[PDB]
Symmetry: D3
Subunit: 163 residues, 6 copies
Amino acid sequence: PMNIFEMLRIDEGLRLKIYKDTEGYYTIGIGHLLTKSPSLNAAKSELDKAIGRNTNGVITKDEAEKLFNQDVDAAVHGILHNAKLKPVYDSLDAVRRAALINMVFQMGETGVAGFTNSLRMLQQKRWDEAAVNLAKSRWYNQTPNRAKRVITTFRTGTWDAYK
Amino acid sequence: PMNIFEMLRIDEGLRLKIYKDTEGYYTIGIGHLLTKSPSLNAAKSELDKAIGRNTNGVITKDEAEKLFNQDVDAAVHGILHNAKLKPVYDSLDAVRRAALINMVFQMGETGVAGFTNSLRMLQQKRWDEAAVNLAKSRWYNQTPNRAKRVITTFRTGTWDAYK
Amino acid sequence: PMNIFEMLRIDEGLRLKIYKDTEGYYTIGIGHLLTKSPSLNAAKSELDKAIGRNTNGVITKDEAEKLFNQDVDAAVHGILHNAKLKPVYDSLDAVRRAALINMVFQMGETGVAGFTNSLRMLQQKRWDEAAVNLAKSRWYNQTPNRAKRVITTFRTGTWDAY
Amino acid sequence: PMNIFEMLRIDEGLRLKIYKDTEGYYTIGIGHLLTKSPSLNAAKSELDKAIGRNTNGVITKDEAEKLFNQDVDAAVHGILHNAKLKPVYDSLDAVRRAALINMVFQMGETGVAGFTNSLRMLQQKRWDEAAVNLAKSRWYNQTPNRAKRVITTFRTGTWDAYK
Amino acid sequence: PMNIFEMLRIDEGLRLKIYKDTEGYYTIGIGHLLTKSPSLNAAKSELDKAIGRNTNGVITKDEAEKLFNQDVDAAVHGILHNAKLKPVYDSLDAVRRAALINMVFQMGETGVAGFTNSLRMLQQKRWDEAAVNLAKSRWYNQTPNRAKRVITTFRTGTWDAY
Amino acid sequence: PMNIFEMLRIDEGLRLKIYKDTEGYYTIGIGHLLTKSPSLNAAKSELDKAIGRNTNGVITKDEAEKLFNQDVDAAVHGILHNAKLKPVYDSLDAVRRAALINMVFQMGETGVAGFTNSLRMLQQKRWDEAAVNLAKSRWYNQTPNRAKRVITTFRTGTWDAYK
Ligand SMILES: [Cl-]
Ligand SMILES: [Zn+2]
Ligand SMILES: [Zn+2]
Ligand SMILES: [Zn+2]
């Protein structure tokens, strides 16, 4: 069973207690940034707001999935209302469409929409060129392994980089 | 490999040329309505518009999927901007969120929002109850089998009713 | 005095207490759906929310018109933001415009927008053709008597059918 | 046959060729303001833009009704997206809801939304006090005759001031 | 230090307690109309709602700026979602953009968009003709002094009038 | 004469011909990103589309300003339609509000909404604390000099950092 949840869960990891991410930012669940501010207290304050209860830095399985969903919806929404993204998104198959959401989920709609070239190659279904072009990005550099898997997906149209 | 496409492919079928649906309405692709008007001519016009070329009632696989993606985006956009529907949707797991999308794709966001008790039940994770409450709708009557599979999906949160 | 209220009042009926509609769905006022769920308790819940008091399934005249207005506003709003509908709507006379609102009130914007052909005929003012075309739909089948009247209004642009 | 059209037609009048209104502003059809600028050539430019053809300052009946409708839609749109107006609008009867529209048609949503007290009284069906309170506005002063009729409509709930 | 606040502060004045404006309308802060209704009690209502506390018709500086900012946001939003205005607004320099905002803050987006010619002349940077043309309006007539300064901002592109 | 324009012009620079920005991304005007794609041809493509003419990688003063205006409006739009940001934005004075827009123009609304603590401190007018707090972010790190001036503005409520 593979989807955007199972995909991202292993790209962003799933944690049930507040942790500092690659950039020391307070995070929880599946790559959910709580706050940029270096205050554990502010993180719990934000998390309490997000979950709607006194969590004291610890949430449940179902709660992190709920947070993940809110994030994903924001990403899908980002795609559906960016004129550079939607048309590309609409031309992809289910499996590849998830690799686009994964990108947007990671770096925001504006970030992903900047890949002017890769985006056209993808729309024209020229995967191999799209793979090497994306491999030439700051994205690929700051997070090589994840980018590999996403790019592999784009190139194969299968879940092989995750199975 | 399961997802909303493979799911809806077997609930709406996949057709490469215009046919009349269960209600004599000109359709193509994956349950894509072209027009309520009883004129094969107006249907090709709509289809010509949608695909962006002279199709003469015949389309390709990619074109059908592209058309499907546009319909799904409309269904997800229906769920996200529906106060009644988003909270429920966000509380569901991957597989079970597919079931909800399926329901909207079939009957529109308003229709689905109409299931007051069933929605709350799902949001509280009382699957069994939701199943029996959903099996009591005009929806279940008019399309018993489809609802069975979708309800089986809500109840087990798995792709069993399709795989 | 004829208008969309009096028009829809007699196409959808006006009932001061909850009732199961043509499809076993709990309803009140002027064809106002409360809930698809088979539980009169849920119906009274939604109704309490909407009306803003403890109704126990019974509302007043004014309360039903308030519930009617909210529904209509949603039909008009659905037309005014439907790229296919608004141009047609804007090309109709006061009376015939209501007949369009009527249809949307009955099946929604995406429903009415489906009648591609008839729509263009109406905006072109070829009434009689629009009549026969609409008379060939699942809409005309499921609810013959009403469609007849609505279509009649499109054809004559008057309140004769009512 | 009475409605918002026939009502505004006799308060705003119906003209087939550009005319200066009460304030020396270029107008046409049913109170359709074309421009504030004192340029007949500027007026004819907007009209050519609005009608979609070379009108040379002259339109048809249907072209004025189409223009009228778009102005009505703008007013109804104004009401339904005004937190202060929609709840009062929803509380009126078909006939009185027309009166409200007439006001918004004449002075916009912000103008009408200003009559704080008269609006409450209307939402509380205290018609006769709303009449006197509206009879005390700059609106009633600048345009006495029209206000009377509209205010009469608000007070009786009938088309008497126009029948 | 010049900007839209310092500008509008001196065109609409800043008051910390309800006052009747030029047309006898209850107002506060920076030209913030409270109610057209002739009731001091109705105005204290709106204000209390606007600020979120029992003000009894008296607010603070910060409460008048907060109320000013929301007024300015509504103006900028009106401009950014009006097809006639945004292209003109996006063609102006920082200073001349304040002047447009001002106008919309005073008379709303509809009123400002009614200046067909003066709007095109602005987009075309033909300032002087925009000046003489805006001076012929009811706007200028009803509020001469404020109009002078604003138009002057359109003609020089500097804060000289302020 | 100071304002968001004169402020951002000296932070983002003003160039009339496409250049690679700090990260090797094709840019023009005032920090306007054309494309993440490593293609000068792609950059000229986007540029042609935005400006709407045959630019060959060169624009006028006015075209830059127009471009800048659009970017600023997007940033302000972002703030205004963000529940975390608008209420803080509405609490600031004209001078400090420009600093917020500056941050949003640089890193987008989401990134700026991330500073949970700093934001609230600005809403409570504890400028000095917001200053130190903000100087502890990745933002201050990657772009020290710019952050200095923007944070100075937040602290003094004056244009001193730019005069
Ligand atoms: Cl079935
Ligand atoms: Zn949306
Ligand atoms: Zn709307
Ligand atoms: Zn907006």
